Every structure is written in structure tokens, then in C-alpha cells.
Amino acid sequence: ALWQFRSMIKCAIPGSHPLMDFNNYGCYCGLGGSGTPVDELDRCCETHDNCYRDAKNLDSCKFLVDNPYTESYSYSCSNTEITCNSKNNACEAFICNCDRNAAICFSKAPYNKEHKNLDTKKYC
Numbered sequence: 001a002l003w004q005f006r007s008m009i010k011c012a013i014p015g016s017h018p019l020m021d022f023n024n025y026g027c028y029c030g031l032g033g034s035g036t037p038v039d040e041l042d043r044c045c046e047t048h049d050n051c052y053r054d055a056k057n058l059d060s061c062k063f064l065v066d067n068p069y070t071e072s073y074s075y076s077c078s079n080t081e082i083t084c085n086s087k088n089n090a091c092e093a094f095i096c097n098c099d100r101n102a103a104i105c106f107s108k109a110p111y112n113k114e115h116k117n118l119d120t121k122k123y124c
């Protein structure tokens with residue numbers, strides 16, 4: 001679930017700032033998106049979006065209001081390392097892994113302040 005994704009990000013990036021959640025970044029970090037990602041960090045968010053799109057396409061998976069962000073799973077954090085519980089059901093596991101890979105992706109991507117709250121209607 002979205003709140004768990006935020007938790008994973010803190011796990012992989014302890015120094016991240018909470019207030020950032022009020023902000024969007026690039027063309028894809030935030031809800032929806034358009035055009036092409038502006039940088040590596042933004043690419044991570046687009047890939048995460050694509051990962052969720054794939055999950056929704058699994059006929060075996062149905063999410064509340066068709067939103068994977070509502071799907072709660074089980075995961076654990078240990079020394080900045082994220083582990084998705086093997087007990088998650090197939091749909092939950094897919095979502096957990098999308099979240100995990102995105103969190104890892106975020107942890108390695110450079111952060112460009114100029115891309116925070118970007119004028120998407122113009123650059124996306």
C-alpha cells in the first residue's frame with residue numbers, strides 16, 4: 001500500500017524528508033504522468049507506474065477501486081535492506097516487488113531540485 005511504499009523509501013533512504021510527500025517530481029513522480037521522464041529519478045517513478053500497470057493487467061489480480069496503491073502487503077526493513085514477505089499473495093507480492101525495486105532505484109538516483117514540482121504542462 002502507498003503508506004508502506006513510503007516506509008520502504010525511508011528504509012532505503014533514512015535521510016529522506018517527510019515534507020517531500022507534499023511535492024511531486026519530474027513528469028512521473030506523483031499521480032499519473034505524461035510525456036517522457038526527465039531524469040533517472042523520474043525514470044524510477046515511471047517504471048514504478050509501468051510495474052503497477054502490469055500488475056493490474058494480471059487477470060488474477062483485482063484491486064480496490066482498481067488502485068494497486070490500496071493493496072497492503074507484508075515487508076520488513078533491516079539495515080536499509082527491504083525484504084518482501086514470501087507469504088504475500090501473488091498480487092501483493094507483485095506490488096511489494098514493484099515498490100521495493102522503485103525504492104532501491106530511488107536510493108541510487110541523483111536528486112535534481114530543479115525537477116521538483118516541475119511545470120509538467122510545459123516540460124512533460
Ligand SMILES: C[C@H](CCC(=O)NCC(=O)O)[C@H]1CC[C@H]2[C@@H]3[C@H](O)C[C@@H]4C[C@H](O)CC[C@]4(C)[C@H]3C[C@H](O)[C@]12C
Nearest residue numbers: 006009016017020021023024025029030045106110111
Ligand atoms: C527519494 C526521492 C528523493 C528525496 C531527496 O530529497 N533526496 C535528496 C538527496 O539526494 O540526498 C523523492 C523525490 C520526489 C519523491 C516522490 C514524490 O514526492 C511523489 C510521490 C509522493 C508519495 O507520498 C510517495 C511516492 C512518490 C512517488 C515520492 C517517492 C520519493 O519520496 C521521491 C521519488
Ligand SMILES: [Ca+2]
Nearest residue numbers: 028030031032
Ligand atoms: Ca506517476
Ligand SMILES: [Ca+2]
Nearest residue numbers: 071072073092
Ligand atoms: Ca492486502
